[PDB]
Amino acid sequence: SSSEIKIVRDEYGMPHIYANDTWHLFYGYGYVVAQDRLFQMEMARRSTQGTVAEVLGKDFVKFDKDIRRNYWPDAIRAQIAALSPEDMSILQGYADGMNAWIDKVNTNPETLLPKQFNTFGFTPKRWEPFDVAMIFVGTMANRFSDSTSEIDNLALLTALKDKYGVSQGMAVFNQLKWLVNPSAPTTIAVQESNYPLKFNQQNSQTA
Amino acid sequence: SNMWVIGKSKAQDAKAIMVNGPQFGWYAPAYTYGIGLHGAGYDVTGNTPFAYPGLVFGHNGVISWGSTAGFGDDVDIFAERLSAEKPGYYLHNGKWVKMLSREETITVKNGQAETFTVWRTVHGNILQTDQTTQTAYAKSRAWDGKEVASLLAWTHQMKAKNWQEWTQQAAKQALTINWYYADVNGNIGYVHTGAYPDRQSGHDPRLPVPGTGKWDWKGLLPFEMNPKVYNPQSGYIANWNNSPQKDYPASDLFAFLWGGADRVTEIDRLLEQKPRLTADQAWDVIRQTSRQDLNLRLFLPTLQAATSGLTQSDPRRQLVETLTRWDGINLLNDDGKTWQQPGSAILNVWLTSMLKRTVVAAVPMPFDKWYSASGYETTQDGPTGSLNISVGAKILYEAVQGDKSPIPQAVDLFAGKPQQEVVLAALEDTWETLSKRYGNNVSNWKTPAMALTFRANNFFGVPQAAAEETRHQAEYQNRGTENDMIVFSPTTSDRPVLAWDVVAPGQSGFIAPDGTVDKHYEDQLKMYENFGRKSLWLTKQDVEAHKESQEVLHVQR
Ligand SMILES: CC1(C)[C@H](C(=O)O)N2C(=O)[C@@H](NC(=O)Cc3ccccc3)[C@H]2[S@H]1O
Numbered sequence: 001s002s003s004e005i006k007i008v009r010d011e012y013g014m015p016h017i018y019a020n021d022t023w024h025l026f027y028g029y030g031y032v033v034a035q036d037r038l039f040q041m042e043m044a045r046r047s048t049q050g051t052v053a054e055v056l057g058k059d060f061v062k063f064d065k066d067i068r069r070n071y072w073p074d075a076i077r078a079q080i081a082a083l084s085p086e087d088m089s090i091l092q093g094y095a096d097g098m099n100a101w102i103d104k105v106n107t108n109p110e111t112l113l114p115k116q117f118n119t120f121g122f123t124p125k126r127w128e129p130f131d132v133a134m135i136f137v138g139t140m141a142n143r144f145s146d147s148t149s150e151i152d153n154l155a156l157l158t159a160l161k162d163k164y165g166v167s168q169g170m171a172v173f174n175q176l177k178w179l180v181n182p183s184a185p186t187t188i189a190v191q192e193s194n195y196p197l198k199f200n201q202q203n204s205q206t207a
Numbered sequence: 208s209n210m211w212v213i214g215k216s217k218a219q220d221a222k223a224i225m226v227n228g229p230q231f232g233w234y235a236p237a238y239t240y241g242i243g244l245h246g247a248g249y250d251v252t253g254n255t256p257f258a259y260p261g262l263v264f265g266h267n268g269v270i271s272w273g274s275t276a277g278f279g280d281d282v283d284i285f286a287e288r289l290s291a292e293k294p295g296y297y298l299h300n301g302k303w304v305k306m307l308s309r310e311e312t313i314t315v316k317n318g319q320a321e322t323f324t325v326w327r328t329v330h331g332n333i334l335q336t337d338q339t340t341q342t343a344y345a346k347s348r349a350w351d352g353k354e355v356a357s358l359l360a361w362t363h364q365m366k367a368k369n370w371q372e373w374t375q376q377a378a379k380q381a382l383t384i385n386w387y388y389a390d391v392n393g394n395i396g397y398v399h400t401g402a403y404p405d406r407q408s409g410h411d412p413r414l415p416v417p418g419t420g421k422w423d424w425k426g427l428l429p430f431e432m433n434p435k436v437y438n439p440q441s442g443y444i445a446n447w448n449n450s451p452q453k454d455y456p457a458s459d460l461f462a463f464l465w466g467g468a469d470r471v472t473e474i475d476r477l478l479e480q481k482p483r484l485t486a487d488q489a490w491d492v493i494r495q496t497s498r499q500d501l502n503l504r505l506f507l508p509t510l511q512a513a514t515s516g517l518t519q520s521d522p523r524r525q526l527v528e529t530l531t532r533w534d535g536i537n538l539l540n541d542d543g544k545t546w547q548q549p550g551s552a553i554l555n556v557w558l559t560s561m562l563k564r565t566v567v568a569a570v571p572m573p574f575d576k577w578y579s580a581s582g583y584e585t586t587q588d589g590p591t592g593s594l595n596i597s598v599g600a601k602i603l604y605e606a607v608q609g610d611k612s613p614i615p616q617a618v619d620l621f622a623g624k625p626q627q628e629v630v631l632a633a634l635e636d637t638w639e640t641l642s643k644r645y646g647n648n649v650s651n652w653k654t655p656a657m658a659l660t661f662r663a664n665n666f667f668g669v670p671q672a673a674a675e676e677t678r679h680q681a682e683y684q685n686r687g688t689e690n691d692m693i694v695f696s697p698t699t700s701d702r703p704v705l706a707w708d709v710v711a712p713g714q715s716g717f718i719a720p721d722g723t724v725d726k727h728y729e730d731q732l733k734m735y736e737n738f739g740r741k742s743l744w745l746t747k748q749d750v751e752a753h754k755e756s757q758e759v760l761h762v763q764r
Pocket residue numbers: 144208229230231263274275276277384448592593594595
């Protein structure tokens with residue numbers, strides 16, 4: 001009963017997992033993911049760890065270097081090693097579930113291997129917790145929470161000061177890339193609250 | 208990505224309605240993955256990007272959740288001081304400190320492998336170095352060290368049964384992400400989640416800081432400072448990657464601004480139109496905002512003012528009359544290729560001309576090209592993501608508002624000329640350009656509609672499917688890659704929650720070795736295009752009543 005995992009798919013194929021502990025729940029999820037989206041997931045893994053060129057060739061080298069340059073894998077592994085048993089069971093159950101299906105695929109590839117593996121000339125390998133973590137880091141954290149253009153901003157500011165003088169140049173920077181603009185429509189209405197901090201808007205870190 | 212959460216005081220025939228449209232671009236197989244989890248403290252249904260353990264979009268029968276990217280400034284660059292006498296070191300708090308470094312080898316199919324080094328300081332990975340100035344730039348993230356915790360926060364939040372339990376997990380999510388809540392009692396809420404640095408006084412977050420120690424962040428700001436609201440007096444929560452709150456600063460990206468011109472106002476206009484919204488009305492906001500030209504509202508007044516004393520036969524005036532008669536909703540003609548009205552093309556040529564004559568001319572090259580885009584720039588595959596008001600247009604909007612704008616116009620973008628003269632000149636350019644392509648009878652102009660493509664290459668530009676698996680839709684729609692809606696305490700059902708979503712092209716990406724596509728490979732494509740939706744089941748009885756197949760596994764860890 002502790003061992004049992006029930007998988008039910010609805011009329012659009014959406015899977016519902018029924019399990020009695022954390023590892024088994026996430027194993028069921030990993031398993032259905034490996035059934036539905038193996039090639040997508042394999043390619044997502046390679047994208048998030050910069051191992052695309054290994055399968056796709058020279059046109060992806062720069063891409064792979066750029067991915068590897070933007071993270072520190074041992075740090076991610078250190079966070080995983082710090083997890084409690086219950087948290088670790090999420091990532092491990094999920095990897096273990098994908099692996100159970102991957103193993104079935106590599107045992108009977110003549111009917112179970114996604115066609116894209118044949119097309120692109122390689123076969124899927126097993127997953128670990130780090131790989132599951134890295135899907136999220138590489139497609140969430142890096143896609144949507146890692147945005148800065150400060151070096152370009154400083155180049156713009158330098159060019160503006162060269163064109164208009166130091167003072168007008170800084171004021172034109174503040175017109176094109178304002179720190180804040182009080183007429184911005186805000187999800188939280190001003191009657192509810194306002195953000196209490198005020199920021200320097202004249203590059204005073206190098207003043 | 209958009210979201211509108213309608214609370215008790217604004218909902219019709221329900222206590223709360225949540226409608227989310229996360230915009231991630233369009234891919235085949237689907238960007239998100241549908242999944243229900245039941246047991247070990249979970250009882251949830253929804254869909255989530257790349258099948259993360261945590262569902263970003265879903266509900267648990269008591270509360271519902273969703274997200275939009277936050278775009279707060281949680282990243283700063285530190286300029287590290289290097290020394291040619293001491294390669295691999297940097298000055299920090301008065302000492303020369305060794306950088307961390309690691310070697311990586313890129314293995315290459317049908318090629319030679321390549322090895323390179325990645326370097327890292329106390330402030331983050333090094334992006335680039337200038338040997339000329341002996342400076343190396345390190346990228347500091349407020350969420351550094353909390354990546355895994357953020358993933359777990361998005362998973363544990365799925366078990367929350369009220370605002371306090373949910374906000375306890377929201378406080379653990381460290382990336383810059385807007386999170387939204389709704390519940391069976393009609394409560395609604397929002398938190399601009401994430402870790403944000405507590406910067407030293409004098410630190411302008413838009414520009415690099417010295418890495419030598421004095422400019423180091425003091426630590427991270429407390430959760431109490433994250434923008435949040437629970438049961439706002441407006442009765443709703445609307446977001447389209449706009450500012451969370453008065454005086455809250457945006458990402459430092461030069462192309463990203465929170466100003467008077469914001470696409471979220473199109474949602475507010477629809478929400479405020481009627482006193483209360485039913486679930487069908489709230490869903491219909493997707494179709495309307497999907498088709499809404501975003502620049503008409505911003506610039507129509509300026510165009511109308513500029514052409515107000517012109518004679519009826521002046522073509523500058525006839526272009527603006529055409530816009531005045533239009534609500535800005537694009538619709539396809541029957542050919543499935545062209546838009547019924549030409550207003551987006553009129554605004555695009557006019558705005559391009561305007562920006563070239565104003566913001567572009569004020570900014571030194573090559574930075575001027577950051578301000579020249581109109582917002583209509585595509586691919587023949589159609590836009591890769593959402594459409595927005597361009598940076599240049601947001602800056603032009605402030606200039607055309609005159610002293611209604613709170614931003615000092617340190618440089619007059621009109622360069623001493625009357626705004627009307629430049630607006631009219633741009634209109635003259637527009638008539639010349641469009642009349643040469645389409646002739647002089649505006650009423651028969653059949654301008655090209657944008658299309659939508661479910662790309663076989665993922666957002667990184669890496670194949671996630673064969674090129675023939677790319678899927679095409681005639682109507683570009685400025686909407687979520689997926690859309691999901693959750694309705695709490697409907698008066699039309701005894702069920703505490705009803706919920707729907709759409710995950711196109713389908714749940715499965717499986718193609719067998721002989722080319723046979725799965726039965727769920729493309730069964731949600733038509734539903735997506737027509738603004739349809741499928742029921743998300745949660746309960747055992749609902750799941751059982753809609754069961755197609757089942758498997759039972761017996762597994763020992
Ligand atoms: C700035 C962008 C290039 C684009 C734009 O605003 O022009 N936006 C989005 O869709 C919004 N993206 C998201 O909101 C994606 C998202 C992330 C996490 C959770 C939900 C949705 C931003 S970025 O893409």
